[PDB]
Design a protein around this ligand. Structure first.
Ligand SMILES: Nc1ncnc2c1ncn2[C@@H]1O[C@H](COP(=O)(O)OP(=O)(O)OP(O)(O)=S)[C@@H](O)[C@H]1O
Ligand SMILES: Nc1ncnc2c1ncn2[C@@H]1O[C@H](COP(=O)(O)OP(=O)(O)OP(O)(O)=S)[C@@H](O)[C@H]1O
Ligand SMILES: [Mg+2]
Ligand SMILES: [Mg+2]
Lengths: 493, 257, 318, 255
DNA sequence: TTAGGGGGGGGGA
DNA sequence: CCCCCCGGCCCCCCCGGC
DNA sequence: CCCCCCCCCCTTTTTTCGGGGGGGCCGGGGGG
């Protein structure tokens, strides 16, 4: 039997048949086609001779963009046009480490039986299209890193499609694929197709309301077609008389991203009487819940970079900043309470008020620059690394010093600076013996020396000081240290 | 219950046939015509093609009005086939435009009937045309020896290389832990003709294959006592297990040089 | 007695789309779909007890008729709906061969889809696309934002609003006429007021009042359905004098058995939505209420803490 | 190819691996003229494994110079899983240890299969074992000891062995309940192997960890009789005997 | 009201 | 005596208000 | 053709208990 076209979804009945029917992202489609067409030539060159486009140093391509823009269709059409066999995997299949190593791993360098039995010069090879890669779950067992390694060792073209490129789980794919971006289609590129669908489906649509519908779905062509199909069932005319209701009913509710959340939260308009009556306090609290792990950090980062428009009479910017900082401190206390052994998550809404909403309301205005990403995370990582180094050094020197790690950092290290680095600056290469003797007296290693010399701050920074030392002195120091037997403090057994 | 009626005198034959290739393919389309039942399927990796033939001589009775196409998920079929004793008669019954098939297990000594209904699947696939090709390599060996060698070599490496030249067969596996090589030579014995390894080389051959697919293929050792491997230069290798009235063929795509 | 009377919520559950009250446009669209067919993938969202599951079941029945048994696969939060179920059971149902009327398709109902894991939702994406020619998906949820955007892109959106008091009165009067219930206008008004747009709650309260007192009047209705405590909390927070607020706290909430944690949570929720009060004043009140809530969570759930919270709130407005 | 050790049946060698392939992973096979000797220690530093095999056990041991055939038991098990248990194993090692040659040969089909394994370096510090006069020395069938250990490892994680005048007691007390097994020395003639022997000098009462004992009992595949030597102030020894060598486990009593 | 800066693509003196 | 099957600890990642 | 304007899209990642889900060995049992 066969399926009548009347029983098929409009998105399938009116799907693109060739690459010239794809709306928007023409440059991305051309880039993907060029990358796939010269894959064999790049393989003959070992993927080392980057071409004019620079796509010759990539064995795989990664297509990314918002939902419903034509990524999968473009990939399939480009694969079919050049005459390759397609092996498609998606989230409906198991793609764990073991399954990936037992499945597509073999197909990476295997001939296609379908290609052989259906024979172009490229029909016997595979074009592996891994779709919904962002849906994969896991850090090691998930197989994302295994897929990244496959991208490096693939012997055939491999295309990855994802919707959220900027995620930690997509970190392994940083610089292993040709990154192609598909952006939201413009109204003009899809106007003709919408008109054709409307005249084919026999309903009346005013061309002027098209832009409103495209803005309602945030560029999703599939959602636009679904909206047309649903509304045309009863409402046979789409015009300005009913555009508002249709837009409101079918308005996508997509959570904002940290930068957008920070921008909207720090806008004074929503904190005015009219703005407050339009964007209510409940809406502001919900905006925080779009990303509750990053919103307070963004607010704390960007609450000092505004020209306020909500200052109370007789109140300066600094006073509002101080009040916001006090409320941020209270919110930090609440956050500490939440993530304790008690697990008081019911306090999450209050945190939203204490960390984002209230402090923003005090400095809400116009951004006085660019919205920056929170620097607390990198600083915390740096602090953790330095604390680990300090612990290692303290326990290396524990048997010789009577103090703790904080006392070692604050008292001992400045004195050690005058007996480990300063002599080299005065006695040149003749201070190696004394410095090595001092290091041995405290069971210190060369890596301990380097870590020590990185702790000093402010006027005691040493990077330039150490660099200015003649290379011969450093080479002699290394040679002398490596040509001697040094004592050991902690015997790991 | 008139269109298609196929009776296996023993239900174990069909269960074994399904067991032979249920670990590689999941959804299989069976075409039943007045001449017998054929089936063609392709695995997910699209490198192994499974073909099955069952003639009218393997059926105690076989009546098919006009050709009928049945899509089946081998997991459900295998689960159903475990519910009947290996010594009972198994009748497959199908009708026009069937949404399901009937599997009737009947035992002679007891007055017991076990009727099961299996829902059919809608599968969209094309019947690949397999044209005869003059393979310049043909080796017929006992199934047990092939299974043993494949299992032994799969432990070390993920790929196995078969090399055919004058009076010698070499199976080689290379892996991180180590390597393993097995050399067989043609041999014939009149007292035990079922262990006679045979070779027919027109041109030397060297082909590498995936260990997983060979491991899946050797699961058909149950059906037949000997396996026939026909190899080529740049064409899929044919692994055939012969049945009384039909056959089970695996076309495996070799790894690119 | 070891016998149970069937609840009116089930005895009078609508069986056809024409018997559903509220959301007239959406129900009309559902009837039009049931008439023509070609049902699209849809997600129905709304507040509890407004007729979402009933609408989905009525549409599925009106579309499939005698084939309902084989053409409908219904799964809810009480059934296993993991990634394995999606990849094996739903896939098998979608791939099943079933001969249906010319313009009909199989239906997969996923009630309370907001409770599904992200993995199952991601897995459903390609299953919906590859088998749309034979199967269609209808999700029913309370929070549409919990459905991943890729799934929402593939489905139509049907948002259900609160039922107006007129619709609730209409349905309650129909049930009363079909049950010979003796009622007074004030009783029905009280039932509607306490229902707060929830048809299930209204019907349950009416049945309980009838079975417990017989006559459906304001007095008997209020003996079954207690006064909503959120309104009492709102009255307490909007009182002019501190003495009035303390009296409301002592007489209407504390002596009635309401817990301090419930009182403080309700106070926070009410303050968050007190549009009459300015946003900054509400923020200060929320800070005070949060301090009180933190104190309560540490173990000091005393009446003195609530009195101090009320005193601080009054001081803020002075 | 100075090292050439032949095994009439490879199974023996496989069994040797089965004895200690769970407690330890990487070992060094210091093959010398007298034979092969290995010493491994678990990650917790509480159990030792000492294995020795002599030229008498090996069919044609013909090593010429000292060699340290370090290997991982995981891969050795995989290579030993190939080949019938009745085939001969001609282990061959060359001048510089880089890879080892496990050659399997069958005479019924006159066919030979050559497998190789890569060798890895291990920072071993082999420690010679001193001989001490242990307080008590008992010997019992391996099956009985394994059964007792498996039975008493379910009711508790610690098993107490008490050796006293004509009596050996295995006790295990936990939250569900207690369990005691009392075995007295006895001798049989129609089945000499099914006998329990005890040498008793001082009363002994030592508590061991059940999980160590579970690993130890796996050596029953080698020998049918297990001999345990226990001392108050020294690690207990559990020995399984081979044709021309031994496999011993040293354990530290707990408290 | 548009945070600053870079990338895409249709229009055009 | 040995292979296949399939239930049962262990492990690791992700939410958490309404 | 370079130039102009407009629009869209990117900047980037830490953690205290309990519960639930999903994947992987392991080992007991049945069976040939
Ligand atoms: N650029 C486009 N031009 C025309 N139709 C499109 C386009 N993009 C999407 N569509 C329509 O939407 C349907 C689905 O398109 P897909 O490419 O599958 O969506 P997508 O871009 O892959 O987004 P996701 O990640 O799958 S939700 C197609 O069959 C078309 O009907
Ligand atoms: N619009 C309505 N018209 C008539 N009766 C209704 C309506 N909505 C609800 N009811 C009654 O309330 C009962 C429960 O309604 P349901 O629709 O099953 O619950 P619900 O709307 O799904 O709430 P949730 O979100 O699933 S907790 C029905 O069986 C009816 O008796
Ligand atoms: Mg897609
Ligand atoms: Mg329901």
């Amino acid at each position: 039997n066969v399926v009548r076209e009347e029983d098929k979804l409009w998105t399938v009945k009116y799907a693109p048949t060739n690459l010239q029917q794809v709306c928007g992202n023409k440059g991305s489609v051309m880039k993907l086609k060029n990358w796939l067409a010269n894959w064999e030539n790049s393989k003959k060159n070992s993927f080392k001779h980057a071409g004019k486009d620079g796509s010759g140093v990539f064995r795989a391509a990664m297509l990314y963009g918002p939902p419903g823009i034509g990524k999968t269709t473009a990939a399939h059409l480009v694969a079919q046009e050049l005459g390759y066999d397609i092996l498609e995997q998606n989230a409906s299949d198991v793609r764990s480490k073991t399954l990936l190593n037992a499945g597509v791993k073999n197909a990476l360098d295997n001939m296609s039986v379908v290609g052989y039995f259906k024979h172009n010069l490229n029909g016997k090879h595979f074009v592996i299209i891994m779709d919904e890669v962002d849906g994969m779950s896991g850090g090691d067992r998930g197989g994302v890193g295994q897929l990244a390694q496959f991208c490096r060792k693939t012997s055939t073209p491999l295309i990855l499609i994802c919707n959220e490129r900027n995620l930690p789980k997509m970190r392994p794919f940083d610089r292993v694929c040709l990154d192609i971006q598909f952006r939201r289609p413009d109204a003009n590129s899809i106007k003709s197709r919408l008109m054709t669908i409307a005249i084919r489906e026999k309903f009346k649509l005013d061309p002027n309301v098209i832009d409103r519908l495209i803005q309602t779905t945030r560029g999703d062509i599939r959602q636009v077609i679904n909206l047309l199909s649903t509304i045309s069932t009863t409402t046979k005319t789409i015009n300005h008389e009913n555009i508002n209701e249709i837009s409101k009913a079918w308005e996508k509710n997509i959570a904002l991203k940290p930068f957008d959340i920070a921008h909207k939260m720090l806008d004074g308009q929503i904190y005015s009487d009219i703005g407050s009556r339009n964007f209510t306090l409940n809406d502001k609290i919900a905006l925080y819940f779009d990303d509750f792990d990053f919103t307070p950090l963004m607010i704390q980062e960007n609450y000092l970079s505004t020209r306020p428009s909500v200052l109370k009479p007789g109140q300066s910017h600094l006073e509002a900043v101080a009040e916001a900082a006090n409320c941020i401190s209270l919110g930090d206390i609440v956050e500490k309470k939440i993530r304790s052994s008690e697990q008081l998550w019911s306090l999450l809404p209050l945190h939203a008020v204490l960390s984002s909403v209230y402090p923003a309301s005090k400095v809400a205005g116009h951004m006085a620059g660019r919205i920056n990403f929170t620097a607390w995370l990198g600083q915390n990582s740096k602090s953790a690394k330095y604390y680990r180094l300090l612990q290692e050094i303290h326990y290396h020197t524990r048997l010789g010093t009577s103090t703790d790690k904080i006392g070692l950092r604050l008292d001992y290290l400045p004195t050690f600076r005058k007996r480990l680095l300063d002599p080299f600056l005065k006695q040149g290469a003749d201070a190696i013996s004394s410095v090595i003797e001092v290091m041995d007296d405290y069971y210190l290693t060369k890596e301990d020396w380097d870590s020590i010399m990185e702790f000093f701050v402010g006027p005691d920074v040493t990077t330039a000081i150490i660099k200015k030392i003649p290379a011969t002195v450093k080479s002699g120091f290394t040679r002398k240290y490596n040509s001697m037997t040094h004592p050991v403090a902690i015997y790991r057994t | 219950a008139s269109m298609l009626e196929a009776k296996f005198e023993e239900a174990s034959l069909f269960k074994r046939i399904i067991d032979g290739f249920k670990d590689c393919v999941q959804l299989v389309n069976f075409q039943c015509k007045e001449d017998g039942i054929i089936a063609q399927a392709v695995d997910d990796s699209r490198v192994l093609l499974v073909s099955l033939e069952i003639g009218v001589e393997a059926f105690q009775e076989y009546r098919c009005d006009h050709p009928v196409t049945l899509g089946m998920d081998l997991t459900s079929l295998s689960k159903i086939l475990r519910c009947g004793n290996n010594t009972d008669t198994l009748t497959l019954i199908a009708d026009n435009t069937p949404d399901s098939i009937i599997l009737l297990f009947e035992d002679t000594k007891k007055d017991r009937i076990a009727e099961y209904s299996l829902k059919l699947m809608d599968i969209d696939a094309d019947f690949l045309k397999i044209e005869e090709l003059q393979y310049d390599s043909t080796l017929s060996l006992p199934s047990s020896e092939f299974s043993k060698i494949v299992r032994d070599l799969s432990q070390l490496s993920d790929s196995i290389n078969i090399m055919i030249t004058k009076e010698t067969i070499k199976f080689v596996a290379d892996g991180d832990i180590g390597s393993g090589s097995v050399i067989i030579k043609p041999f014939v014995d009149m007292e035990h003709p079922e262990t006679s390894i045979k070779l027919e080389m027109d041109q030397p051959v060297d082909l590498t294959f995936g260990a997983k697919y060979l491991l899946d293929i050797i699961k058909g050792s149950s059906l037949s006592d000997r396996v026939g491997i026909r190899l080529s230069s740049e064409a899929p290798a044919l692994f055939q297990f012969d049945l009384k009235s039909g056959f089970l063929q695996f076309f495996l795509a070799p790894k690119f040089n | 007695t070891l016998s149970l009377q069937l609840p009116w919520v089930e005895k009078y559950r609508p069986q056809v789309l024409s018997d559903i009250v509220g959301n007239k446009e959406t129900i009309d669209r559902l009837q039009q779909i049931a008439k023509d067919g070609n049902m699209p993938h849809m997600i129905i969202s709304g507040m509890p007890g407004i007729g979402k599951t009933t609408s989905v079941h009525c549409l599925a029945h009106e579309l499939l008729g005698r084939s309902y048994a084989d053409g409908v696969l219904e799964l809810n939060a009480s059934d296993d709906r993991g990634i394995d179920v999606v990849r094996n059971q739903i896939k098998h149902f979608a791939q099943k061969k079933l001969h249906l009327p010319p313009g009909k398709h199989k239906i997969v109902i996923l009630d309370e889809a907001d409770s599904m894991t992200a993995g199952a939702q991601q897995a459903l994406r390609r299953t919906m696309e590859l088998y749309s020619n034979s199967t269609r998906f209808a999700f029913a949820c309370n929070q549409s934002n919990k459905i991943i955007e890729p799934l929402q892109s593939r489905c139509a959106i049907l948002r259900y609003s609160k039922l107006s008091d007129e619709d609730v009165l209409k349905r309650l009067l129909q049930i009363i006429k079909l049950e010979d219930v003796k009622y007074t206008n004030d009783g029905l008004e009280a039932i509607i007021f306490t229902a707060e747009g929830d048809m299930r709650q209204a019907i349950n309260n009416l049945q309980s009042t009838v079975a417990g007192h017989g006559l459906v009047n304001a007095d008997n209705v209020f003996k079954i359905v207690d006064s909503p405590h959120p309104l009492i909390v709102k009255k307490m927070l909007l009182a002019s004098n501190l003495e009035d607020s303390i009296q409301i706290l002592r007489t209407d909430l504390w002596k009635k058995g309401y817990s301090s944690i419930d009182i403080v949570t309700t106070s926070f929720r009410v303050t968050k939505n007190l549009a009459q009060v300015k946003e900054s004043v509400r923020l200060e009140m929320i800070k005070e209420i949060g301090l009180t809530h933190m104190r309560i969570l540490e173990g000091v759930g005393t009446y003195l803490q609530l009195a101090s919270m009320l005193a601080k709130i009054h001081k803020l407005n002075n």
